[PDB]
Structure formats: structure tokens, C-alpha cells
Amino acid sequence: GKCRGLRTARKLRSHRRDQKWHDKQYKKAHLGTALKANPFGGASHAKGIVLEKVGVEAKQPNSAIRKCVRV
Amino acid sequence: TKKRRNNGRAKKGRGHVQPIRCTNCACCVPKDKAIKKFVIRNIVEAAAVRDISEVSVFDAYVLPKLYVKLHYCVSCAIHSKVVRNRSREARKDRTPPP
Amino acid sequence: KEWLPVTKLGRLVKDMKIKSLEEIYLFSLPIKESEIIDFCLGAALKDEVLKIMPVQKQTRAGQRTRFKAFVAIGDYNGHVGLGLKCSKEVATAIRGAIILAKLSIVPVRRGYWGNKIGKPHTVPCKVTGRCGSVLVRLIPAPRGTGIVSAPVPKKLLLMAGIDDCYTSARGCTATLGNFAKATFDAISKTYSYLTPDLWKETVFTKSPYQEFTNHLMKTHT
Amino acid sequence: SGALDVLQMKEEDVLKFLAAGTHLGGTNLDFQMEQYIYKRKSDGIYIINLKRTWEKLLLAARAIVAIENPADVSVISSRNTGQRAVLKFAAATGATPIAGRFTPGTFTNQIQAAFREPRLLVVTDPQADHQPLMEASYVNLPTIALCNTDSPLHYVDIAIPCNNKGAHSVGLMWWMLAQEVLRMRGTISREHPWEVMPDLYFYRDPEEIEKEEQAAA
Amino acid sequence: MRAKWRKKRMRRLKRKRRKMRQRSK
Amino acid sequence: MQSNAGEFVDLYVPRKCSASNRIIGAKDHASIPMNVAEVDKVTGRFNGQSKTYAICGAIRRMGESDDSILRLAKSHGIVSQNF
Amino acid sequence: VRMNVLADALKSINNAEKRGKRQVLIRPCSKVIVRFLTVMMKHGYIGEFEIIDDHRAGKIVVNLTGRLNKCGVISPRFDVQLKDLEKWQNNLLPSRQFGFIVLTTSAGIMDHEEARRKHTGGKILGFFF
Amino acid sequence: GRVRTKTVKKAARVIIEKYYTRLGNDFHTNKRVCEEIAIIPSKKLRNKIAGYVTHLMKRIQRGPVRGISIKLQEEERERRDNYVPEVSALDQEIIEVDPDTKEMLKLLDFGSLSNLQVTQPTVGMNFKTPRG
RNA sequence: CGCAAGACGGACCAGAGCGAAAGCAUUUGCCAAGAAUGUUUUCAUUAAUCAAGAACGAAAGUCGGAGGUUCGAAGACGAUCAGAUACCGUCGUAGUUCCGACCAUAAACGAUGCCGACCGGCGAUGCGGCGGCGUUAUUCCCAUGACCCGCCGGGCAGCUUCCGGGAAACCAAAGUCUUUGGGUUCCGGGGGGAGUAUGGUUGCAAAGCUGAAACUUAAAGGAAUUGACGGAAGGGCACCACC
């Protein structure tokens, strides 16, 4: 900490509370924007319908077809 | 990184200095920043002081010198070999070489 | 197998006349012979190589791959050293680092947590030691705690003879050069820390050079 | 050295100090050397206090006599002004000389043949002999220094404030230091002033050697 | 791309968005 | 340095700087127990006994080892009080 | 400005230890400083001092040994109970063998091992080991 | 072209260190010395050694050489052990003493001696080499 | 040779000063201001730092009025080139100059918040003060100036070093730090997306201030080292180099 005064509890608490938003993983779990745009909506599993089977091209030096499924 | 302890210049407690127009270029270099030579020189270099004294009117008339102060920018001092890339230790030497 | 010594200290260590290396450590004499530590701490002293680290300098055409060897050393009651040797073959780097560990071995001071019962088992106080960004705090723990630390300083503290110890390392500890020397700098500052137990004055006993100067003038040239 | 009239500042030694110019020091003063100088003259010369010049040479001469083997006192000069003086002091006291070219790593490197391992150093100038002071920081070597008014006290343990710049005020301060050490071992008695003349301890100018032959032809 | 001209191309691009929001307002 | 029986347990008691009271490290190689001679009151010669001083590494490279010797020898009555 | 007189006066005598001054001077004199130094002196980390009266805040020349490793100050003055005195001494001091947190109590300024005897908590001043 | 290599110059500085007594000025005599006092496996290299030996040997006829240390240079140190001058430069009866050096001796025991000349101060105190 | 104009204030000019910063250099007069030093004056804690709120703020740019010598975005042309709608040349619009309102940003940098303490040395300088031989002008003496030897305080710097620190470069601060706390304000949390979208607010406008996310990615990055390379500066050498 910086300000160490004995009656500086509300500043030291409130300054953290503001600067904790600048933490990436805090703002992913305290703004509901990630929880909104999470395709499962906060589930570990989800049932869906296979509408097309699509073979994805592997990225850098690894040259291969990654056989995925659009659900 | 910070290559020099001064900022390749001679302001330390100013904030601002007047810009100089360079002699080779017309660059706007700060005055303290700019490489300066007060060139004092005879009107002829070596080979002509013989003959111009021979056909002179007055008996042993000393000729006038040519007092011009040059202001070189960093680019036109190193191109015309006025200043030069010294070693990372020997840069610090602020001794005008004889 | 002889070791006919070179330095003035090494002469008396061959003679069986200076019987403790605690007499060497008292006068801060530079041990610069390999076989001074091989003499006293001969049959107890355990060598473990921390890591073989292949270093490279990019030259005109191709790289020169040399091999850095970090050797932790120490008998399991008091003495430890951390030697580093860079060589072109690994088997000489491992060989050369075990020697360079010995020249720079220190005694660890060991004290007590709370009650002062039996033999000492922990660091006498809290000592920090560092090189680079790696800061290694040593903390005295109660009996039967063990070395609560990373695998690496545990390997130097199991060799120190310190049974029970806490740590709180801080920095790029992944680099084993800075991390082994930080924890080594800590266990060297255990005896260089003036506790209120040691206010009782230093009686200046005679140096091993001061006493046997009459031997130093009859044994060799 | 203190409150003994046996080792008190002798009357015949002050008349050597004034002629030699040991009092007559440098133009700049080192902050570490204020304690050894009475007063600064006009024309910038620091008057080195000749008791506190004397007093410091006694304690220096004590620490040499406290070495049981008189041969492991490494007596070093690099500059000409004390090249002879050290090589005579080494003969008088029985000490070890290196007069000119102090090889870096003599005290530190083992495999070097020139690996002497001394017990006390005597230095002609802490700057001229900067190198012996630093190899004195790697192996446990205490230091006597023939200090000047400006010469530093970095890695020197018993400073002797002297005019080691002057030609005839080096050998004169090796003369006091050679004498004092020899008496305390029980060789020279304070009855008779010493057989050796203080003019032996002077580096002779080769100009004044090709002059002395012409003068004394 | 210089960070000075990247800025200049964002300033022209923002200028074009005030231009095209006004077509609806 | 005692246990809880009172017996001395640590394997060596390191030296301590006579000038600054700071204990000399087992590898502080700029630290030196300088021996100063003792003079017989009227003979003016080495008694065979000495005066032994420890000045730690940091003081020599600070440049204060000879100011301290000049002050410590004064308390042992070597250098004249007046000085 | 000078807001903690005890903080400056202990830092001034901490720099003298780390440098190696044989005695040290501190400019303003709170009674808290003298009451701090008496606890330092009775444990015997420092030698005797004498205060220097000018009709102002007092000055103090403290005669140092080289025993004092660090002289600390805990600003702000945390009010401490007997249960919490263990937590303060188990991180701020080197071991459970030596080192002394002096903290002001209603029984006057005194060390932590005495606060366990007298059975009185209070506001933390600093430390020395 | 003719620059002596370290295998020539080191045989030059050990043969003179050991066998100074046997050598001389003449090349052809100490060409032949090098056969008895050394095992030189070449005809040519022996002459290269013995050539610069005679060069150094003509220099030890004069004075001190850098990389040589012999029993005769020990005898010079023994010869120069015993120089004796006439009564000293330090035993004068006119010795120049400043008033400020007269003041400090007056605070010593030796306030007024028999054999000193006191002076007057050099007023116009200019003792610094100017700036630039 | 004269003249009229509008700019600008060389050399003197400095690791010199002042100002809160931006900035500020012809002579004099005028009008307020200010530090530093001096102080055996006076009040007697009146203070430090500061959300909100505000003053000022280079250049460019905007609005109006005046002025337009030089320079000169845009633009006209001549070159250069494969091309140059670039560098280079000659012209020239806005502007550059001033007056009154706007704008509030710069690598606005010492890339280093401010107040305080403590912790080495060294030689300079700037301002005030104090004291000290002598040199010098007012000559007809004092006191002032000019120097000359120092000291104190304050300021801009400089050198030095195992103070110590740090990833190092470097730093008497960037030190007094796991031995972690003098006070306090702003502020950062992998690279991007992005200073973007959106909402407010400011402005005549250009734009400023506040300011995300979806997504994307395993590195981006700092200091240093070795090499290779250079349309960098040198120092060599060779009839597979020239002379």
C-alpha cells in the first residue's frame, strides 16, 4: 500500500475495489458480459444438434485436418 | 536506452532554448544541442601568402583573418567528419582534442 | 594421490597440525586448494549436480555449445558449498564444479525455535540472501517441520544439516543459477549475523600463520 | 610509542625532516588525512604535523617487529623515487622487496612462480602502489602506507603522512622506518646513531651519476 | 504503419462514422 | 550459544571487528587481525607479547581502518595521548 | 514535513549503524524517543546518550555500539491486544530468541516480553533486533 | 624479415641465465657452447639461438636486460649495496623554515633550534593554474 | 547611395540565470511580482499532500479585425526515377506577425509526483552573506567594485567510489527494502482488439476528457551479450589489389 494513515480504511478498501476491475479474471466474473456471451451460459456440459460435420485446418507448422462438428 | 547522461545537449535547468538553422542543412537544431566551431582562418591556406605579400603596396602588411562561427547539426557534423562515433566509455570525455 | 600443497595454509593441512577448518573460517583465510576440504570433510561430503545447463555463443559459422554444471556439496551437519563450472565437455564441467563447490564451502550457523532443548535443528534467525531478482528468505521452523521450500534449496538445506526450515522465495526462481546462489547467500549470512548472544567480546587467539611460522621456515624452500 | 622518552621524537630527526621536506606536503588535501596536518601554508602547501608524522611511523615500525619471520613483510615500490629505498630496507630489516613492476595476481594466483604470501605490506604511495592494496583485499594482508596529503587511505591500515613526491623525503622516511624496526628486535642500541648513513636510501639520478664522476674526477 | 498515422487513420475513420450516423438522425 | 543444559553447541564462534563491533564473515578476506608490538618501558624493545586488533573488510574499503587503529592504539596507550 | 518525530530519530540512528558512526545525533526530541532509547539501553543494543537542551525541541547524541542490526518504526500506531501481540512478534522480529517490539501501554512505554508479564496491550511504536 | 620467434628468444634468456660464464662476444665460440650445454635438434635453429645470444651478450657487456636474472646481477646488487657519499645534504646549518612551520615547531618541544634560518611570507598568493 | 516595409534580436551565449510549467535575450523608462541570503523583528501551528472545483499552458488549428518582408502545408512547374502525385530547384495558398476571443494537446521528458529526514568525498560555478595578506581603479584617504584565499546558506550542474540499490544500463538517488510501515496524491495488472464502440460532457469546428465488450493470441517486451550485416568512423594487408 501507499497511504498508511490509521483512519484510511474506506480509501484503501475502495481504491482496491476500483483497481480490482483492471484485473482481467475479476472483470470476466463480475461484469455479466462474459457470462452473457459464454455459449453454454455457465454449464460444464451442453446437449445440441449436429447440423454439419466440418473439417478444420490445423494452424501453424502442424499441417493437418482437425475433424470437428458444428453443433 | 538512455545513451547519454545529458540529453546530447547543454540544457540542465532551462525548459526551452532558441533554435539555430544549420550551415550545411537549414535544420532547426537547438543552440546548446548544436555542434559549434568558431573557425578563425587566414584568407589563403598556405601556397598564396607568398605572392599576395610580394605584390602588396605596404611593407610587411599583415592580412585580415576570417572570423565565422559554424553551427553543424548532428547529421551534418558526422557526414563532414567534424564529430565522430567514440567508444561507449570515451563518449564521456568532454575534452576538446589537440 | 599426493597433493603436495602450494599455498601457506595448505602446507599445515597436509601435516595433520591444523585439525579443524573452523580454525580456517575464524581468520577468514582464502581456501584456494581443492584438497583442504577433501582432507577434513573427506568421508562425509556428498556431491549432487543441481542442473547441466548448455550455454551457447553464436560465432562466425555455427554455435559453440559449452556446458554449465551447478554442484551443491555438504556433509549432513554444518558445511555447504555451491560451485559453478562452464566447460566444453560435460564430464569435466561436472568434475570442475565439485572442486569449485569445495573452495567456497561455508559453515552454517544453526539455532533454535522457541525452546533451546537438544541439538540445533533450524536457522538461528531470519536471513535473506539474493543475486539477480531471486530473493530467498530463510525462516526458523519448530522441530519435525522439515525444509518447507522448493526442491532445489531443500537439496542445499538437506546438505546444510538444517532439518526444519521455512522459506519465502521471490523472483525468476526458474533460473537455477540465481536461485541456488540466493539460498546459498542466505546460509552464508547465518554466521555473519550478530545476535545478542554474541555481544560477549572476541578474544583474539593466534592465527595459524602467526603460531607455526617457525615450521613455515624449515619444511620447504 | 606514547609516554616513553625512549621512543619520543628525537632532536636530531627534526633537522632531517626540515632539510628533506617531509613537512612540505602537496597542493590538494584528502579528507581522510586532515588529522595528520597542522596547518595549510600560503602558496598551497599542507604542513604535515611532524609529531603525528613521527607517532604513526612508530606504530608502523611496531607492526613490522610483531612479525616473527622478518622475511614475509612484502615491501613494494613501483615509482623510481623509492625503488632503491625498499631494496635496502629489505636488506636491513630482512623483508621481501618488489622494486618496480608489481605483477597483478602475485598474492592471488597460485600457479604463478611469483606467488609470495606475505603477512604485512609497506607501500611507498597508495596510488603508485594501487595494485598491492587490491591484492591485499583478496588474501588477508594488513598495510603500512607512506601516505601523502592527497594520497587516499583506501585499503591501508596504518597511514604514515609523508612527502613521498619529493626525492630526498622518501629515503629519509624509509631511514626512520628501517632504524626504528631494527632497534626493537635488539640489533641497534639507542646509544650510538646507526652505522648506515641516511643518504644510502636515495634513488640516484643517472644524470647525476654521469655528473658525480665528472664532479669527483 | 507508424503509430502517428495509425492515429490519423482512426481520426478519419471516426469522422466517417459521425458522417454516417447523421444519415439516420 | 548454549543448549538447555548450558553446554556450548555451535561449531565455531566467529571473530568481531574491534572498531565497528560487526562480526567478521567466514569469507570476508579484507578482514585482518593486525598484531602491534609491545615495548619494554625503558629498554625500548619488543617484549615478545603483542596488541591484536580486528578491523572488518567494509572499514578498509571505506578507508577508515587507519583512523580506527590511531584511535584504538590510543586506548591501549601505544600512541601518545597528546598526539 | 516532519509528521512522525520518532520515525526520523530511529532512521537517523539506523543509517549510522549501517554506515558505522561511533555516535549519532537526532534533531527533535519527543519523550517517546527517550522512552524508546531507554528500552534500547536497558536491553543494551545502544550505549548511554545525553540530551542537548536548546529552548526548543531537544537534541540527542546517542553513543552507538555495533550491536543494533535494525531500528524500526511501525507508522501508523496500530492498537494491539495480547492475542495479536503474538502475530506482531512472529513476522516483525527475526526469531522467538531475541529482538524486542517496544509498544506504548497505559503502564508506560515498554517491550513486548514485559507486556506478556504486566498483562497490558497498547499502540505499537516500532522494533529493534 | 629477420624477427626472432619465442622459441629463439626463450633459449636466448635461459642459456644466459644458466651458462653466462661459458658464453662470450664471438658467435662461433658460443655457437659451439650451445651443442654441449643444450640438445638442439636442428642445425639452423642453433644459429638462430646463438645469434640473438651474442646480441644479448653484447648488451650484458653494457648494463641491465629485462628478461635475464643471473648470479652476476646479484653481485651488482651486492656492489651497489656499498655506495658511500660525503657528509649529507640533510646536515646543513642554513635550513629554510617558514613562519607557519616555525609556529608548529613552537607547539612541539623543539621551539627554537641552533641551526635554522626563519624567513618572511611570500605575499601575492597566486598558486592555481587557471581554468581552460 | 538614399528610401519604405514587416519580421528577427547573431557573435557576446555558457551543461550560466530566472519562471509553476509552457516559456524568456537590442536601449531606456514605467508598473506590479518573486526567490535566495541577512535578521538577538513579528504572529505562534497558521502546516504537508490533495477527490470535486479552478488558473496558466509551445506548436499547429478555428473565428473576426489589421498586416503581409522572409519563410511556406495545400497547390503550379522543372528535375530524379520504371514510377515520385517524394527527397532536390524556382514560385506560391493557408499560415508564419500583431489585436481580441477559442482550443487544452506534445518524446508538455529528467520518459523520474510533491513535503520531510538521514546517509561519502572531490574540484568548479550562480546568488546573497561573513571574514582574510596582498594586486588594482576612483588618487587626495575611506568605503565600494575588479580579482586573490576560504567559510556558511540556497540553486543548476559536474567528477569520483564496493554508501547501497537494481534485470542491468545506470543511480548520492532510481539509496536508507523479506532486516518489508515518514506523510500523501495520481496511477499500472500478458500482447492485441483500443484509446476503439457506446453514453455523457466540452468546443464554432478540428477535436479533448471520461470509456468498455465480443473476440483474438503464446507471447509482445526491458537491459545486456555474442555473432552476422551496414550505402557508419577508422586501422591494416595482398601484383589471385592498384601504382
Author numbering:
A (entry chain Y): 2 to 72
B (entry chain b): 2 to 99
C (entry chain D): 58 to 278
D (entry chain B): 2 to 218
E (entry chain An): 1 to 25
F (entry chain W): 1 to 83
G (entry chain X): 2 to 130
H (entry chain S): 2 to 133
Excerpt from the paper describing this PDB structure:
Colony collapse disorder (CCD) is a multi‐faceted syndrome decimating bee populations worldwide, and a group of viruses of the widely distributed Dicistroviridae family have been identified as a causing agent of CCD. The IAPV‐IRES found in the intergenic region of the IAPV virus belongs to the well‐characterized type IV family of viral IRESs. IRES sequences from this group dispense with all canonical initiation factors and are able to assemble by themselves an elongation competent ribosome, successfully redirecting the cellular machinery for viral protein production by an RNA‐only mechanism.
The binary IAPV‐IRES/80S complex populates three major conformations, with limited differences between them. Class 1 is unrotated, while classes 2 and 3 exhibit a small rotational movement of the 40S. No populations with wide rotations of the small subunit were identified in our large 80S/IAPV‐IRES dataset. In such position, the PKI of the IAPV‐IRES establishes a network of interactions with both the large and the small subunits, effectively restricting the rotation of the 40S. This interaction is maintained along the small fluctuations of the 40S, which, locally, are restricted to displacements of a few Angströms. The limited dynamics of 40S subunit rotation observed in our large cryo‐EM dataset reflects a solid anchoring of both ribosomal subunits, mediated mainly by the additional contacts contributed by the SL‐III characteristic of Aparavirus IRESs.
